[PDB]
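PT: before anyone asks, these are the final sequences, not the draft ones from last week. 1420 residues across everything. Please model them as a single complex and drop the result in this thread when it's through.
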Amino acid sequence: LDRAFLDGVGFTPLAEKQQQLQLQLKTNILTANLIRSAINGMNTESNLEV
Amino acid sequence: LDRAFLDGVGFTPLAEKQQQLQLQLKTNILTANLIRSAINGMNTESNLEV
Amino acid sequence: VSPFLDSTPFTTLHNSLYGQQIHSIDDELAQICKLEYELQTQIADEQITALKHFLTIRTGSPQEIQYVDKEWMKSNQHVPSFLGDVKLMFSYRVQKKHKVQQPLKPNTLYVYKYKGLPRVVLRFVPKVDTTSFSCDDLSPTWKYILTEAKRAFPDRSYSDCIHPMTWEEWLEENQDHVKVLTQYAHQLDYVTLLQDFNLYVSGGASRVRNIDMSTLPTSINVLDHFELYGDASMKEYVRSGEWYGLLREIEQEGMTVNESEKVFANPDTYVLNVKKYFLRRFQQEIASTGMTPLTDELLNIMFVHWNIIVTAEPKLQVIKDDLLKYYSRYGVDATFDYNMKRSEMTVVTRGHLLAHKVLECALRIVETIYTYDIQDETFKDILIDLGRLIMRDPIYGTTTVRDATTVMKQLMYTQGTQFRRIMFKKYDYSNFNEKLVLKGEQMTNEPPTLLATTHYEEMDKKRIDALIKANQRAGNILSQSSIERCRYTDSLDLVGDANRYFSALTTLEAVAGFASSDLLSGFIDSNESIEFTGTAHLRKLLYHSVREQITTLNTSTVPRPSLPKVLLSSAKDTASASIEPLTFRIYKTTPEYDGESLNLVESTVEMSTRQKKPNLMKAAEILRSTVTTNQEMIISGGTRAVQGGKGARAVYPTKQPYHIAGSLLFHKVDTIVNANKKYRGVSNKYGQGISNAIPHIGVPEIIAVSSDGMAICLALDVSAFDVAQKYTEADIELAMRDGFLDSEISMISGETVLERMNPADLANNLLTNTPPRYKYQTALGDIIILQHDNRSGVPWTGTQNDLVNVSNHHMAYDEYKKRVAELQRQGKISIDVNDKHHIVRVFGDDSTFIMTYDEPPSAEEVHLMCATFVESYQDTAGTLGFAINARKGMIGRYGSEYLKNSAIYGNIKSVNQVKFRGSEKSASYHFGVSEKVSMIRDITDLTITRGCDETRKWKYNLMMLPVDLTTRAGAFRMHNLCSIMTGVGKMYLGGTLNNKLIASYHGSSFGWNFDDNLIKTANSIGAISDSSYDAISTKITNLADFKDSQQRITRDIITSGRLPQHLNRYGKSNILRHILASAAMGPLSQIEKNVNAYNVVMGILNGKLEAPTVLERLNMGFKYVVMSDLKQDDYSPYSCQGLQYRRMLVHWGLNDSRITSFDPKGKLQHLLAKNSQILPIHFDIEFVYRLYLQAGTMGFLQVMSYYQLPDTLTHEMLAAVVALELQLGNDKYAVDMGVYSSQAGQIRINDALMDSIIQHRRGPPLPIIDRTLNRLLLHTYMLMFGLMGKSIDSTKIDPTLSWRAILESNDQRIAQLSELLTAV
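LR: through. Structure below.
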């Protein structure tokens, strides 16, 4: 029943989340930080199932 | 016997290790660090004999 | 003293540096350059004379030469200073027309002279058309040809000659093989006609043959003479007329008189004119594009340079004898009037229909014999006899001898005495990523235990029958000689120069070029040889296997691209089926300069399309309302042609919505299948993702399975696989449908509009069978059909083919195991012969089967088990349409055969068979000098790589460099000489290696500084065409597309580049504005080449060109280089190549991983592929290359650093792209797709060992802008000295130059950051 009547999901796109994170981190753009580089390997294509 | 029956070796490419190290070091890319520089001269052409 | 001699090979540089001592590397390179300069001089010395003779024959005999070096440029000239920089800005109305004094003399020769080297020939014909059967009305070349032929052989009816077939003999030979379709009376569906009659012919005359239009033209004929295909009873023509009479008398009273039944009984309908039928059949069947017109090749290779050819091989006199007698005996009918009406050459037949192909074959015979350096008797003989057999019938004879040639290629090595086995390391068949390394050789007398030892007589009789059938119609070529000599082919051995023979034999098989077969006849018989008779259990097994195999692949975490991205990916695909260009009107108001025959003229003529137009304007409708369901609609059908004359291949194009919807449904299946990098994954079975460009890396398993004795290979091949599925399509498509219902979280909701549908919804609508109908054009009418099956242009044909191929293989192996177990319990194969691992690899239709054993079964065991398997597959996996033949595939042991690449005893036997000189679907005769020089160098490189002597092939190629590369510039003719090949990066004295950079640095003193600038001015000025952007003016439409495509921005839309110089051209908002022009260069690039043809002449007319390049300004080099001798052993898996190349390969070993080796053509493409899901919408190799070309090294970084991409990888691929731009020039063919350096990619010089060669540096890590440059220079240096015979094992960076290089970024990063510091 849940599968048949949940045809979509209202997720915000990942690009806006990346941009919001970039503005909040105090580290320099050139300096490498793992938290920033880790979320870049994500996609929202399995959001409906979850 | 070991030389005759050990014809391969499962190393990871040096490029991946270099990228992992550059990502792990929380130091500016512009400045010079002698740890990143030192491993830049390594070669993996004598792994089998070792 | 003539260089054109076999005694003088361009290979006199290998034994040079082998033994003696070498010093600092500055003077041996100068010595090589000086020697090549001398060679080029003696080459041009006779090239000019050959050009003079050719022009004297082609035109009025008086011709005189005059050296026109820079000192002469002071002489009378013309200067339109205003119209100087010729360019295009923005049935014709003529502009201002001012006269010019015709600076050049009408009929003379002007050869250049730059630094003592004649390199450019210039002349012009001032449009001397006076007022604008009949043998006199022939071209002067044809008149000379006829006069010489008549002088040679007048009359006497010279025997063993050409006897063109006539109509009344063609009828006696093929009267039982022609039938009339008779639309309503064939009683077979999926064919419908609207011409009231049509001709079906199979076997008898399926390909047109050499017949004359005048013997028995038989203006009108009654078709009843032949037979009715569908019914024997309804054939009488009298009843076929009395029925008409009775029905007409009934109709007088008043009757329904069904038109189908009535008009059939009219004897009138069976009327046709043979001449029109034959002409139409010829004008869709044989294609003639090539690269040069044959009238130049005919006299140039047979009446001026003939002494060169005969002096080496005397057996070739027979071909000229045959050609001259053929011209003398009949005369006039021989015709080659070419019609360059718009841009396409179309031959026009008159005396004979296949007269052209006859000449094609006669020239390709001598071409093949000369280039392949056969060093054995009776083999070039048997080649000559096969050639004289294909002489008489150029197309039908090709198929007649195809059987004999392929069965000859089948065994070809069974009776041997030595083989020189090649030994490799053990290869793990399980891991697909496994690579092979060579280890040594061993000599062995054991013949390969292939098949056909059981069926030796069955094939010997078959080939002998084919040969006697060819001979009986031929001119009695002493069949005893043929039967005696054909048995010589299998008494060879894999030592010495015998490996070249297998490669050479296939080249002769494609002597005629690109013929096709009738489409209707093929579509008739291919749908008849299919049998269903079988059990429903097998159908259930197939259904369940397919459904299970789809389910395991669809479920994954791979992302699915959105519709706006997938639309622009479709345009990039440019499928020949998919393309449907449509433009309401693209007015070519381009002001084009005109020939200065008397006065300069400016004219504008409109032209439309000429390139794939995606109809992105109509995307508005495609994205929104568009239903993807099929209901008996009609679409147009296109056909392709193949070499070898095997048959006609049909492509079934699909509408845009279907292709778009399909790509989304299978994106997740296609990606995993084409993983490229996969390790022991379930995907392993599929090999769809391979380079395929080179054999060692692409198909490692086949070579190994061919040398190892503990495994066997099963390379069975099937009949027409796509047609064979027409009886199981309803089940496999159903399995495809319900395999996407599960493992998908979304549920069906029933929508019919694109973008308003779930991923699951697409499946219900798309995979619903019911295929469309296809309309193509044939002779005497156009026919439509309905094909149930995998189809062709379907967005999943390869996936479906590999899913079906891997399914029945399991069911065949299942029962083969039972049969083998049965044989084991009785006394035959014996116990202890049990396989452990079996691997099946599928690439579309073709598939292979490899089984490994612990104890290798003896020779007859292999035959028994292979026969058992082939019998098992033919009843278990062939009862539902498929058909396997043991005699069709290289089944057996010690040798495996993948797609056109096969390996025996560790020796690769590539098939080459590439013919640029006679290509099909091309306009090389109207191509630019740049495209010609790019194609002239790479196809020949492949030919030498796949087995050909480097010396003779390039000698023959050099015999036409002036005759080719003749650009037309409105009464301005050029004739380039051998020097031009230096600019693209080829050294004659060197090997087939891209020695471009090394030449260019030394291309300062020894000339060679001119040709590179010439090719640059021929190509690079098309950047003005790029700078000619077309604004939106006449139409707007829904224009919702710009809203449709968008990427997140950082510097708004009014920033990221204050000046439009690097802002407006790459605007996020202007995405589609940019790609509209960046998808249409060609339609006006073809005429931009035409206008650039003026500028290139004006460069040599004026003081332009001759300037030094910019590459040599920067100082790069090494110090303290250590150099030692090469290994000097010859065991290489590529036995067809030259001795020196084999010596290089063993020293360094086989190349691996095809990525570490730079090859900047594919490195950045691989980086781009691995970079998905962060890339913006519009991105590809073309965009990056054009952006770098337009914006230098500043604007590229400026624009992309504000487009939301991280800096490190953008910098890395920027280094890759500058390396690409410095490796060679532009070339539309080179940048698009791309072309490898072959020899340079099959030798391990990757960064793995290249890092070890460079001595470790103490200072800071060098930037990537120069590391990829200096290491590329080191790679080129490594490839050259080795050809000479020495190797470098140590190299210092010369850090006094490295500091200047580290200083660059110091002030460069500063420029990048400082412009940020100000908000300009």
